Design an enzyme around this catalytic site. Structure first.
Site, PDB file in Angstrom:
ATOM      1  N   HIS A  55      -6.824  47.349 -19.506  1.00  0.00           N
ATOM      2  CA  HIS A  55      -7.084  46.971 -18.126  1.00  0.00           C
ATOM      3  C   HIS A  55      -6.424  48.058 -17.286  1.00  0.00           C
ATOM      4  O   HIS A  55      -7.034  48.598 -16.363  1.00  0.00           O
ATOM      5  CB  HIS A  55      -6.487  45.598 -17.790  1.00  0.00           C
ATOM      6  CG  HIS A  55      -6.722  45.167 -16.370  1.00  0.00           C
ATOM      7  ND1 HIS A  55      -6.336  43.934 -15.891  1.00  0.00           N
ATOM      8  CD2 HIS A  55      -7.312  45.808 -15.331  1.00  0.00           C
ATOM      9  CE1 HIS A  55      -6.674  43.832 -14.614  1.00  0.00           C
ATOM     10  NE2 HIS A  55      -7.268  44.957 -14.251  1.00  0.00           N
ATOM     11  N   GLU A 129      -8.374  51.565 -10.761  1.00  0.00           N
ATOM     12  CA  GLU A 129      -7.056  51.594 -11.386  1.00  0.00           C
ATOM     13  C   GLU A 129      -6.244  52.841 -11.077  1.00  0.00           C
ATOM     14  O   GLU A 129      -5.030  52.753 -10.878  1.00  0.00           O
ATOM     15  CB  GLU A 129      -7.204  51.421 -12.901  1.00  0.00           C
ATOM     16  CG  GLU A 129      -7.624  50.016 -13.275  1.00  0.00           C
ATOM     17  CD  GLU A 129      -6.525  49.013 -12.999  1.00  0.00           C
ATOM     18  OE1 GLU A 129      -6.838  47.854 -12.664  1.00  0.00           O
ATOM     19  OE2 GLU A 129      -5.339  49.386 -13.133  1.00  0.00           O
ATOM     20  N   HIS A 133      -2.866  52.628  -9.031  1.00  0.00           N
ATOM     21  CA  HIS A 133      -1.649  52.810  -9.817  1.00  0.00           C
ATOM     22  C   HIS A 133      -1.305  54.226 -10.248  1.00  0.00           C
ATOM     23  O   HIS A 133      -0.276  54.428 -10.887  1.00  0.00           O
ATOM     24  CB  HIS A 133      -1.742  51.937 -11.070  1.00  0.00           C
ATOM     25  CG  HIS A 133      -2.041  50.497 -10.785  1.00  0.00           C
ATOM     26  ND1 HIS A 133      -1.077  49.598 -10.379  1.00  0.00           N
ATOM     27  CD2 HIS A 133      -3.204  49.804 -10.833  1.00  0.00           C
ATOM     28  CE1 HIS A 133      -1.631  48.415 -10.194  1.00  0.00           C
ATOM     29  NE2 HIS A 133      -2.922  48.513 -10.462  1.00  0.00           N
TER      30      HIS A 133
END
Ligand SMILES: [Ca+2]
Length: 245
Positions: A55, A129, A133
């Site tokens: 993920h 993502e 992040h």
């Protein structure tokens, strides 16, 4: 290749986020959401452990960012988009493909696809993502996504991944899961794991593991983890969901 931050690198951990692919799909279905191509294509396979997909890899709150007033929750919610800093464009789940192309190499893109069904295509999970992040840290996408893939494999190959594999479709207790984890990495590191479930009876949808920032570029061991306060919303027994709605 080593994963290294170029800015805001003063955080102590990374949360490796893995999802129990079958469960993930099961939840999107039961919530009456639109079936993604990753779930619509989802099918049974030889190694059940392979249902454990990537993920993401989420750095914890950088001290330099906290120092400016950002708290844990705000960081958990916006990541690289928090204000006053890093203050980058907010990554939205409703428009993952709108985030910037990462610049990931074709080779790493292929490795990622095999374990991150939502990457590329019409999902663009890796862009979302990375914008949330990684972008604010100046992470080399290849080293960044390349590291997720490695970590996911080590997990799958440990007693944790084997536990999931052997109990595929069965109801397990958090207690035995914990023993499976502690078996490969120590009783004291059991608290580094947060589990997410859906439905009632609860079934697994995600596994979150806290890894030391300093140990991110090495094979996992009993010194690579950091305990964290959230056991999860799974309860003391849950189901390792099978493929199919
Ligand atoms: Ca299912």
């Amino acid at each position: 290749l080593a994963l290294q931050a170029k800015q805001y690198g003063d955080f102590d951990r990374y949360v490796l986020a893995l999802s129990w692919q079958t469960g993930f799909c099961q939840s999107q279905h039961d919530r009456n959401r639109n079936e993604r191509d990753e779930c619509r294509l989802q099918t049974e396979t030889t190694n059940k452990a392979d249902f454990l997909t990537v993920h993401g890899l989420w750095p914890g709150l950088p001290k330099s960012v906290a120092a400016r007033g950002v708290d844990e929750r705000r960081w958990m919610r916006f990541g690289c988009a928090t204000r006053p800093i890093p203050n980058l464009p907010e990554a939205r789940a409703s428009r993952m493909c709108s985030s910037p192309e990462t610049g990931l190499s074709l080779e790493t893109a292929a490795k990622l696809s095999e374990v991150m069904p939502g990457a590329g295509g019409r999902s663009c999970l890796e862009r979302y993502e990375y914008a949330k992040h990684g972008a604010c840290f100046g992470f080399d996408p290849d080293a960044y996504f390349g590291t997720m893939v490695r970590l996911n494999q080590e997990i799958k190959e440990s007693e944790a991944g084997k536990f999931l594999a052997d109990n595929y479709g069965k109801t397990v207790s958090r207690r035995d899961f914990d023993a499976a984890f502690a078996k490969s990495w120590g009783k004291e590191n059991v608290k580094a794991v947060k589990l997410t479930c859906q439905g009632n009876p609860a079934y697994l949808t995600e596994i979150q593991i806290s890894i030391k920032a300093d140990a991110i570029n090495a094979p996992l061991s009993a010194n690579s983890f950091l305990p964290q306060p959230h056991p999860g919303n799974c309860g003391k027994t849950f189901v390792i969901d099978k493929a199919g709605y």
